[PDB]
Structures are given as C-alpha cells and as structure tokens.
Design a binder for this molecule. Sequence first.
Ligand code: ZN
Ligand code: ZN
Ligand code: ZN
Lengths: 65, 134, 266, 46, 33
Amino acid sequence: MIVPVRCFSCGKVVGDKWESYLNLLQEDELDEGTALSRLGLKRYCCRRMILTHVDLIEKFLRYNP
Amino acid sequence: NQEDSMIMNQSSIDRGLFRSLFFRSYMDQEKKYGMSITETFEKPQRTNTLRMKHGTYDKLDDDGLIAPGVRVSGEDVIIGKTTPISSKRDASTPLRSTENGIVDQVLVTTNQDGLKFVKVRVRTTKIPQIGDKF
Amino acid sequence: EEGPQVKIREASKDNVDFILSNVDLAMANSLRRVMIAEIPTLAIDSVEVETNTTVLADEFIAHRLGLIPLQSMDIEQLEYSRDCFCEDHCDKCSVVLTLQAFGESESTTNVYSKDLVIVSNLMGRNIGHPIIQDKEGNGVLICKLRKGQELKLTCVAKKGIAKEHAKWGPAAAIEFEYDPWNKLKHTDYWYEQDSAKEWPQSKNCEYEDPPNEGDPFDYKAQADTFYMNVESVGSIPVDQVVVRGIDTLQKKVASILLALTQMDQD
Amino acid sequence: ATLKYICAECSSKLSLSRTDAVRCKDCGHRILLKARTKRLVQFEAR
Amino acid sequence: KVFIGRLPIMLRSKNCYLSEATESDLYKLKECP
Ligand SMILES: [Zn+2]
Ligand SMILES: [Zn+2]
Ligand SMILES: [Zn+2]
C-alpha cells in the first residue's frame, strides 16, 4: 500500500527508493540484503522499512472506478 | 513503561507509525405500508411536528444524504427521512454521538420490494495515542 | 583557535563525520538534540482536496505530502505563519503548491513529488522546492492510479520544527559516541567469559590510544572528543544542519540572558 | 458541468430524482454511488 | 418442473460463480481474490 515516505524510526527519506529497489531485483538479479546497502539503507531501522512493506496498493489499483 | 505498558516514540508515530483507518456504516430503507404510505428521503424543517433532532441538517443535499467530501462530526445528521403520519416526523439518522470524521462513500439502491436503500460510510483516521492498546 | 575545535573526518553532500573536541558532554548532546528537533524547516502543512479518485484516502495522502522534504535553505527569511499578521498565511510566510494527475496511460500512472507546482511568489529565495536526489529524477512516489483516477490538490507549506512535528526536522539520524575504550567506566560490559572478545570494537578506537593494563584507574578524567556524524534529509546542506544547530541553540541561550534583562528594570 | 449519482462499474455521471426508479442507462446494477462535493475540504498535514 | 423454495448457497461452493472464475475475472466482480 504505497511505500512509506521516510523511515518511522530515524526519519531519513525513503519513498523514492521503491522502484529503484524493486528494480535491483528483477533486472540486476540481486539478493535483497545487498540491494539495500546499495540504495544507501545502512541501518536496520530504515533497512527494515523497505525489506518489509507490502505494496497492496498495486493489488488495489487492479480494481475499477 | 512499567507493569505492562510501553513508551512509544512519538516522532515515529508522526512519521506514520501504527496509523489506522476505520470505516463504519449506517443504513436505512423507506418502509412501506400496503395501504400506500411511504417514508421519504428529504431535508425537512419544522412544519407542524417539531419532532426532529438537535443535529445540524445543513450538511445534507436534497436527496436526504450527505456526499463524500463532507466532514461530519458530533450528532450531525447523515440521512434525511420522513414518515407521513395522521405530518413531519423525522426518521433521519445521526452520526454516533461519540464519533466524528469524514463521509467516505454513499450509495442508494433498490430493495426487492422496490424500496429506496442507502448505506452511508463515514471514515476516520486514528493515530496511536496514549490510552491505546498494543 | 580558542576552544571547542573540530577535525571533520570523512564528509560529503549528505553526511558529516566529524571529531568535535574539547567541550562538555552536556553541550555536545544539547547541540545534538537541537540539530534533531529545533532547526526550522519547511514542509506542506495543509491540504485542500479538490478531487481524489485514488485508492489512498485523502488524509492518507495529505499525511504523505507533509513528509515530502521541501527546500528550505532560505527559511530564516520567511516568518512563522503565526506572526505574518496576514489573516491565515501571506507570501511572506508560506509557499503554496499544486498537484494534478490523470490516468492517461492505459498502464499505471506514478504521481511523484516532482509533480509539485509552486504557485505563490518565491520572492527569489531557495524555498519550497520538492527536494530530489533520485537517480532518474522524480523523487518520492506520492501515489499511483489507474484509468480515470483523478487527483487535484492544494498544498500550503509553512515553517515549524520537529518538536512540533517530525515532518519538519532536517536531521534524519545522528551518530554520537565517545570513550570507545570505556576508560571512564561509564558502562559495565555484560559478558559470559570475557567482555573484550564478546563486545565488538568500534572503528573509532583508532583515534584514541588503548588501555594499558597495569595502570591504575584515572578518576579525574572527563569527556572531550565526541565522534559524531550528522546525516541530512536534504532540505538543507548537511553542513548548515550542523551550523544552524550551533546557532538556534546559541540563540536560545541568548533569549534567557535577554529575558533576564527585560526583567532587571523592575 | 454538474452531477449526481454514479454507475458502480460502468461509472457514468447519471443523476435523477423522485419516482425515477433507480437503475442506470444500460448497465442495470441498481447500486449507484454519489461522487464527491464541489466544496473543497481541508486536511491536516500531520 | 416446480418451484419449491430457495437454498442459501455457500460461497466458493459448487453453485457459486466464484468456484470456476479466475483472478482477473474476480476483481471485475469486486470480490477480493
Ligand atoms: Zn531509519
Ligand atoms: Zn501572513
Ligand atoms: Zn450502470
């Protein structure tokens, strides 16, 4: 349900790295843990922010009006 | 944090932590009487009876309902309805005395017997506050 | 020069690894706290919703927007809405933005923060620009939408600081540390057989000489040297976040001396 | 330029009034929503 | 040949259109998959 802007814990911004992250997977075929360190997410507080999140939204969109 | 109760960092509360949505949803129909007498969904006012509600009807349209965008709160009305009795007695439905929020989706439909059927859905947002359980 | 000097280590566009020396812990932290929740910044603080057909509900988005980092280097010259005598926001105390999106593409339309349009007079001063550090250049995906999913917004940035709501603070996380070789014994290491091995060694150890067993316990020792690292969200160059901090604080300690005077007259 | 109700799937600004039953111009589905209100609504940024 | 009452069917059973239907097919029905 849409990436969150900034990591609840520390605050650094985050909401942009979505597609960037979700990309280093399908295209650059990488392992999560490494992708993140590559997106600048160093600490678990933020790290977890992405790694977890589920883009339900996408499934929402698939609806109608 | 003592004895089963924690200290929750507010800062993150703000950054969106544990925010919840909450939808409720009232509903009413135009009861019918074989001997032809029907209720109705209008925005009445005085005119004989007096039997209305304290709530502010002023948030209703003309069909007797509210529309999405609106921001309901206390005991404001949410549905206008009148019963012809032998002639202005209210059957309108207020927003639960203790809640408050924003209407979110309404809908009028027919009920087998060809009655008007409505379902109002008022959404609110709740944020992790102190008394809250986790 | 005179007192609390500095030796910045690594340092970039978003981080400021620096060795702040010869000071008092108190102060070292004070500053830290300030840099965190008392440095003024701008961010969307109101949303007039014209039309939304997205899945996300109003306030939801509303909320998101707040967080959207906004430019604010020239924030020191844009009065706090609660002072701009104007009844409810002047160009002299608040920027105003807009957002309009439509489901044209028969294939998911991403609404980023780049789509934000400033509508009021900037009066020529870095402010209210949705900060962007994205590679492609469209930072902060604010929301998505399908077919004829419409979205029309009216954002009203204002001053405010973390203390008043996090969406403001330009901090985002600050490293802090000292006495890496616990010499003041400000901590009792928890162990199982030998602290030394069990308890990791921080990189900062190199910048200060190790223990040396035999030597008694140094009791007069206090705390100089604090290995800090200030990160930034971007609404201000890392550096200022350090400076503007050292300032706001500086300014506060003044308001006290100042207030004491406005009280010496009677 | 002005509106009222809506098709719950074949969404097409409809609108109506008393005794006009409650269907839709084709797509029967007697459901119908009611689309937003022009008057803008304000929200908190926190 | 003759009408004799209504049997409240159970969702996803054999008589519920949902049984046979597919993902996309569902969303168009508004029924969460
Ligand atoms: Zn974080
Ligand atoms: Zn003003
Ligand atoms: Zn229809």
